[PDB]
Design a protein around this ligand. Structure first.
Ligand SMILES: Nc1ncnc2c1ncn2[C@@H]1O[C@H](COP(=O)(O)OP(=O)(O)O)[C@@H](O)[C@H]1O
Ligand SMILES: Nc1ncnc2c1ncn2[C@@H]1O[C@H](COP(=O)(O)OP(=O)(O)O)[C@@H](O)[C@H]1O
Ligand code: MOO
Ligand code: MOO
Ligand SMILES: [Ca+2]
Ligand SMILES: [Ca+2]
Ligand SMILES: [Mg+2]
Ligand SMILES: [Mg+2]
Ligand SMILES: [Mo]
Ligand SMILES: [Mo]
Ligand SMILES: [Mo]
Ligand SMILES: [Mo]
Ligand SMILES: [Mo]
Ligand SMILES: [Mo]
Ligand SMILES: [Mo]
Ligand SMILES: [Mo]
Ligand SMILES: [Mo]
Ligand SMILES: [Mo]
Ligand SMILES: [Mo]
Ligand SMILES: [Mo]
Ligand SMILES: [Mo]
Ligand SMILES: [Mo]
Ligand SMILES: [Mo]
Ligand SMILES: [Mo]
Lengths: 414, 414
């Protein structure tokens, strides 16, 4: 317009407030990594479902006390015992095996001495119990770990490997979860060639599409490649319409400044009839970053029109797009993790809040990590895992110094 | 045997020392996430390949100084200009467009005032240049960012989205990288049923296979599901042989203690002819953890036989298996990230080093995260992202207290 300068805080809140939560679907539990449960999950069985030995040893009657006992048989994992242990008798048990009727404690083998075995040495016949067992010792009673009817996972749970294991444990192999967003990515500019192309006069290769698609894929979300679109409103509208049809989220880069061949804001408003919530953000880099929504038949589509400069595109993707996607896939608090780190070098502050990719590293025993802004040789074998978040300068603070503590958004595996 | 108790430090070093680095393969750069480059990568073009405007404005002759200028044409992104700017003239430029012959600086539009435009207002004819340009201002010279022949990525680089973007930029769309390990996972025990099964007497559901497969998949590695194997040496040998054929790494759980129906160590040694490097580790949980290698025709297979207890299996998988896999896929320093955190609760120390899953959380402005051992309601919506690493007790230290600083291995996204 130019659009009003929007503060970072307002822009970020606006993205989260205006972004929808996707609907739900039933998935197989093996496909649950990173998904958010949209149902509570209950156990239909006890764990353990039988009284289970926690040791290799003997199932005994505690009342018998220590002494010499006839071994009447063995309880092995996976088989329900049929015999009842009577006074003066014991049954061999292994870890995880059921406790036979008549026994009320387990004595571990280390607290015993073998008296007699078969001539072939394959069968134990008589054992000395050296200790006084406590009633119930070394037995997991029925339901000790999980009770039938217990809620073991609550709706809203963001699942990792252990949650998948718990679903397996309780036999709940299909669960309701939020859908993942499908994210379409488009590059714009008459100067852009595909990565596969040799250069031609006046042209460069499109890098943003690759970088943005990889960023989204890193977070586990399905993507759509919408290719390169030229600087003209008809082609841009057609590409946006394809994105809307095929995806939940459309990410563009380029063409959002006020230049003569920058059409995206006009197309979003006048042709697409989308609602542009902000078109400029008071931030460095990322000034022309644009966020729009489009409501079609009770479905809200999300559009991020990011700056064309490659550094600006990847920075703004991490600040605005990734949290939106986290909200869409059902994460209750979709905010990124922000940690405290020490600056590895002095840095000049800008009137705008500043953001820069960095590498976070821990040093021996020092409690806080160091943040080294990207751009020793070894500090190049590693990809950026942080985004430095530097404050606006004040009449007081014009610079931050090496060692001073700053906020860093986590954007990669530490 | 019982095998010697191996210290944690020795066991860990032994895994890393004995684990091979996999060979290399050529991949498409879009498939490069998490891969390690096995070649240096060079630029074959300059970036930018032409002198490029960094602003919307006018390409000028700095020697002309400020004043009123005829606009002879426009240089738009993607088109090589044909006209030469002479004294008294300027050419309109947009960001990323080539600088025409004859011009040596760019003046941004904000430092100008328009004098004359066409009757239709679509074409600018005359402009007032308000500033004295510095030579070369607001131009990226040829090769400013990347030079032809420059090494832009070194062998050993562990790639993320920005590295993929750089490959796209320089047009190197196929790269040599280390292979990813294929990891086969097996559960053992006559008591185990599939997750899909209803319980039967004496039985429980297999959870470890799901948890371990999910853990490995979370790190991006392909997996093989070897199912459930009973407690007998013939079936175990057959399953191990299948794993060896189909995978680079075999993970088993269960059957590694000294129980009567525990055969895995015997099978690995006597039947498989593998070299067991340790069979017990002085650690809690994880005492019976076993690591073996098998060399077949110049190929080294890796076998981890983990404890059957589900908590022990997932803990030892994170401590030993994941670093091995990182080495196999070419990561030069495969050690996990360890951070410092504050204990959320008092904890009793064991003679053994202790490990427990936890959740790491940052609090407002406090520099160090808090580590809350797994097992408010909201602290259940989140999956474990840390492994607490507690020291062995000493005659002095028998307990650690809330707030004290401890080591935590990162095992999930923070
Ligand atoms: N996909 C892309 N890959 C690499 N560079 C790009 C890409 N898109 C745009 N650029 C470059 O970024 C710079 C700014 O582009 P521009 O379209 O003006 O961004 P905006 O107008 O959105 O701020 C130009 O130098 C342009 O060539
Ligand atoms: N895949 C599995 N899923 C769930 N529980 C298991 C699994 N494998 C073993 N267990 C249980 O873990 C416990 C220890 O098993 P065990 O085979 O004795 O381990 P190890 O001998 O290797 O220490 C037993 O209670 C057993 O039923
Ligand atoms: O206008 Mo920017 O600073 O390249 O996003
Ligand atoms: O023997 Mo463990 O402590 O279950 O691995
Ligand atoms: Ca452009
Ligand atoms: Ca077993
Ligand atoms: Mg532009
Ligand atoms: Mg056992
Ligand atoms: Mo135990
Ligand atoms: Mo900017
Ligand atoms: Mo910038
Ligand atoms: Mo800029
Ligand atoms: Mo700028
Ligand atoms: Mo700017
Ligand atoms: Mo800009
Ligand atoms: Mo920029
Ligand atoms: Mo710039
Ligand atoms: Mo243990
Ligand atoms: Mo244990
Ligand atoms: Mo144990
Ligand atoms: Mo134990
Ligand atoms: Mo133990
Ligand atoms: Mo054990
Ligand atoms: Mo255990």
């Amino acid at each position: 317009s130019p659009f009003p300068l929007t503060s970072m805080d307002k822009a970020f809140i606006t993205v989260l407030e205006m972004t929808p939560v996707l609907g739900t679907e039933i998935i197989n539990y093996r496909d649950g990594m990173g998904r958010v449960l949209a149902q509570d999950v209950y156990a239909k069985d006890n764990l353990p479902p039988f009284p289970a030995s926690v040791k290799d040893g003997y199932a005994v009657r505690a009342a018998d006390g220590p002494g010499d006992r006839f071994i009447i048989g063995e309880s092995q994992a996976g088989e329900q015992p049929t015999q009842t242990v009577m006074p003066g008798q014991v049954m061999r048990v292994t870890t995880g095996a059921p406790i036979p009727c008549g026994a009320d404690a387990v004595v571990q083998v280390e607290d015993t001495e073998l008296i007699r075995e078969s001539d072939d040495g394959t069968e134990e016949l008589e054992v000395r119990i050296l200790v006084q067992a406590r009633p119930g010792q070394d037995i997991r009673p029925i339901g000790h770990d999980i009770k039938r009817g217990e809620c073991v996972l609550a709706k809203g749970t963001h699942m990792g490997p252990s949650e998948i294991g718990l679903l397996a444990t309780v036999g709940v192999t299909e669960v309701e979860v939020n859908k993942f967003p499908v994210v379409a990515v488009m590059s714009t500019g008459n100067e852009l060639l595909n990565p596969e192309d040799d250069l031609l006069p006046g042209k460069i290769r499109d890098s943003n599409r690759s970088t943005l698609l990889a960023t989204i894929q890193e977070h586990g979300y399905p993507t759509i490649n919408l290719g390169i679109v030229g600087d003209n409103p008809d082609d841009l509208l057609n590409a946006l319409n394809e994105g809307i049809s095929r995806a939940d989220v459309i990410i563009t880069s380029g063409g959002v400044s006020m230049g003569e061949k920058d059409y995206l804001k006009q197309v979003l408003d006048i042709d697409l009839h989308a609602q542009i919530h902000f078109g400029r953000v008071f931030m460095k880099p990322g000034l022309p970053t644009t966020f729009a929504t489009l409501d079609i038949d009770g479905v809200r589509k999300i559009i991020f029109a990011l700056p064309g400069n490659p550094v600006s595109a990847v920075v703004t993707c991490n600040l605005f797009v990734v949290p939106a996607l986290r909200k869409m896939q059902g994460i209750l608090d979709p905010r990124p993790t922000i940690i405290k780190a020490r600056l590895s070098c002095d840095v000049k502050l800008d009137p705008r809040p500043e953001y820069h990719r960095c590498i976070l590293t821990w040093h021996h025993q020092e409690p806080l990590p160091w943040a080294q802004s990207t751009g020793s040789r070894l500090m190049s074998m590693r990809s950026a895992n942080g985004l430095l978040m530097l404050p606006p300068k004040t009449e007081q603070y014009v610079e931050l110094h090496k060692g001073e503590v700053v906020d860093v958004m986590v954007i990669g595996r530490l």
